[PDB]
């Protein structure tokens, strides 16, 4: 009822506080409806050269000196971004009512399995059919350019763009998304959850709040809730195939170690 709406609004405020680049801002940028200088477009090797110092990268040497292979430099940029995204999602998850009262080991398991699915949900907010916003909206990397990278790296983003076209077709907003992501985090079917019932209650509660939010915010979109629920399983498949590709990279390309946070997340995952 009224309390469910209050919960939705609390989560939306926490979402705005936790995630600096929202879907609203991203769309403003993607549609050219902002006063800001339009993003630098990386559509090819030369545009990547120029644009490259715009990529949000902090390390021993500048991104240009990390590898002679351009695809490997894109790999390191994406890894750095994903680490910061995991930090962001962790802060949001702690803001979710009831989350900090679960057994800490359950919080860790839920975050582990949930965070990639949440990353792919929010990545769609930064995408259109032609490419993806990077570096807090200061850059735009084309889908074609990503597809032109040598194997294995060439197939990394295509399932994400394909997912994103359908997901964006749902025309969700940030208020919808805050609850959707909270729902994904509190999945009770994650392997190894020790104490399931409190998680199941919170996820149940979030699902009623989500239902009410979509009924109020999208009155003419019939069975939108069902469509959105069906998207979570898709996200799981995306994660599975992504992990297989990552395993290829580990077994194939010389010294391809990952950041310890991502290594921790993928280790013994499923």
């Amino acid at each position: 009822s009224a309390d469910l709406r209050a919960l939705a609004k609390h989560l939306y405020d926490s979402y705005i506080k936790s995630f600096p680049l929202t879907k609203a801002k991203a769309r403003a940028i993607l549609t050219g409806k902002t006063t800001d200088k339009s993003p630098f477009v990386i559509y090819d090797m030369n545009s990547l050269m120029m644009g490259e110092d715009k990529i949000k990268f902090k390390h021993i040497t500048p991104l240009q000196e990390q590898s002679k292979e351009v695809a490997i430099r894109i790999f390191q940029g994406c890894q750095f971004r994903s680490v910061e995204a995991v930090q962001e999602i962790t802060e949001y998850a702690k803001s979710i009512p009831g989350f900090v009262n679960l057994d800490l080991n359950d919080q860790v398991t839920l975050l582990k399995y949930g965070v990639h699915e949440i990353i792919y949900t929010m990545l769609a907010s930064l995408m259109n059919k032609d490419g993806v916003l990077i570096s807090e909206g200061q850059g735009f990397m084309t889908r074609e350019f990503l597809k032109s990278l040598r194997k294995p790296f060439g197939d990394f983003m295509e399932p994400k763009f394909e997912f994103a076209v359908k997901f964006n077709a749902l025309e969700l907003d940030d208020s919808d998304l805050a609850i959707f992501i909270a729902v994904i985090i509190l999945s009770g079917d994650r392997p190894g959850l020790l104490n399931v019932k409190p998680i199941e209650d919170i996820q149940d509660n979030l699902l009623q709040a989500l239902e009410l939010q979509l009924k109020l915010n999208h009155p003419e979109s019939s069975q939108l809730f069902a469509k959105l629920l069906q998207k979570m399983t898709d996200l799981r498949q995306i994660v599975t195939e992504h992990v297989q590709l990552l395993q290829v990279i580990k077994k194939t390309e010389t010294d391809m170690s990952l950041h310890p946070l991502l290594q921790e997340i993928y280790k013994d995952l499923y």
């Binding site: 962790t90 702690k94 800490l104 919080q107 860790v108 975050l111 582990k112 946070l261 921790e264």
Partner: peptide
């Protein structure tokens, strides 16, 4: 395991 996630969760 997962010391880094547990530390990220303990602020």
């Amino acid at each position: 395991p997962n010391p880094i996630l547990a530390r990220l969760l303990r602020a």
